[PDB]
Paper text:
[name] [name]-6 physically interacts with [name], a protein that shuttles rapidly between the cytoplasm and centrioles throughout the cell cycle. The presence of [name]-6 and [name] at centrioles is essential for formation of the central tube, a cylindrical structure at the core of the emerging centriole. Overall, these findings led us to conclude that the segment between residues 125–265 contains two independently folded domains and encompasses all structured elements of [name].
Native crystals of [name]-5CC diffracted to 1.8 Å resolution, whilst phases for structure solution were determined by single anomalous dispersion (SAD) using trimethyl lead acetate derivatized crystals. The structure of [name]-5CC suggested a parallel trimeric coiled coil, although this arrangement is distorted by crystal packing that intercalates the ends of successive triple helical bundles. To correct for these distortions, we performed molecular dynamics (MD) simulations starting from the crystallographic structure of [name]-5CC, which rapidly converged to a trimeric coiled-coil structure. SEC-MALS analysis of a slightly longer coiled-coil construct ([name]-5CC-L, residues 101–206) demonstrated formation of a trimer in solution in a concentration-dependent manner, with apparent Kd of ∼3 μM. Both the crystallographic model and MD simulations show a series of hydrophobic residues (W133, M137, L141, I144, I148, L159, M167 and M171) forming the core of the coiled coil and enabling trimer formation. Interestingly, we found that all these residues are conserved or conservatively substituted in [name] homologs in other Caenorhabditis species, suggesting functional relevance. Taken together, these data support the notion that the [name] coiled coil promotes the association of protein dimers towards higher-order assemblies. We found that the thermal unfolding profile of a [name]-52–265 L141E mutant showed a reduction in stability of the coiled coil by approximately 25°C, whereas stability of the Implico domain was not affected. Substituting an additional core hydrophobic residue of the coiled coil ([name]-52–265 L141E/M167E) effectively abrogated coiled coil formation, again with no effect on the Implico domain. As anticipated, coiled coil disruptions in either [name]-52–265 L141E or L141E/M167E mutants yielded a stable dimer in SEC-MALS experiments, mediated by the Implico domain.
Author numbering: 129 to 175
The structure:
């Protein structure tokens, strides 16, 4: 029963980890896109 409880905690910890990893990947891709806009902004903002 203790082992079954451990397994139940494990499968949910995996779902939470995958959801966090997928959200992180999406947010960091968006950050790269924003950094490029912010650099193209800052460059033309000088000249």
């Amino acid at each position: 029963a203790a082992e079954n409880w451990r397994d139940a905690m494990k499968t949910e910890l995996q779902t939470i980890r995958t959801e966090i990893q997928e959200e992180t990947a999406r947010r960091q891709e968006e950050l790269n896109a924003q950094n490029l806009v912010k650099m193209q902004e800052l460059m033309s903002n000088f000249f």
